[PDB]
Design a protein around this nucleic acid. Structure first.
Ligand SMILES: *C(=O)c1cnc2ccccc2n1
Ligand SMILES: *C(=O)c1cnc2ccccc2n1
Ligand SMILES: *C(=O)c1cnc2ccccc2n1
Ligand SMILES: *C(=O)c1cnc2ccccc2n1
Ligand SMILES: [Mn+2]
Ligand SMILES: [Mn+2]
Lengths: 8, 8
DNA sequence: ACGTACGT
DNA sequence: ACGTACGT
């Protein structure tokens, strides 16, 4: 759920 | 992510 | 269930 | 002169 590199 | 010239 | 982020 | 960055 976090988006820092994918943002699921 | 390394920073040795840009640091991203 | 998911990888993005640069230049001296 | 090289890899760090999170939870809905
Ligand atoms: C977001 O909160 C989140 C948490 N755990 C994960 C595990 C695997 C893929 C994506 C995920 N996203
Ligand atoms: C994004 O591509 C990405 C990859 N790995 C991680 C590990 C820990 C926190 C955040 C991350 N983000
Ligand atoms: C940092 O770990 C890192 C890794 N690969 C990259 C590629 C392109 C721009 C920035 C990057 N940063
Ligand atoms: C910084 O500007 C920079 C440019 N190219 C590189 C190549 C290899 C290692 C580190 C680098 N840093
Ligand atoms: Mn991963
Ligand atoms: Mn987790």
């Amino acid at each position: 759920x976090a988006x820092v590199x994918a943002x699921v």
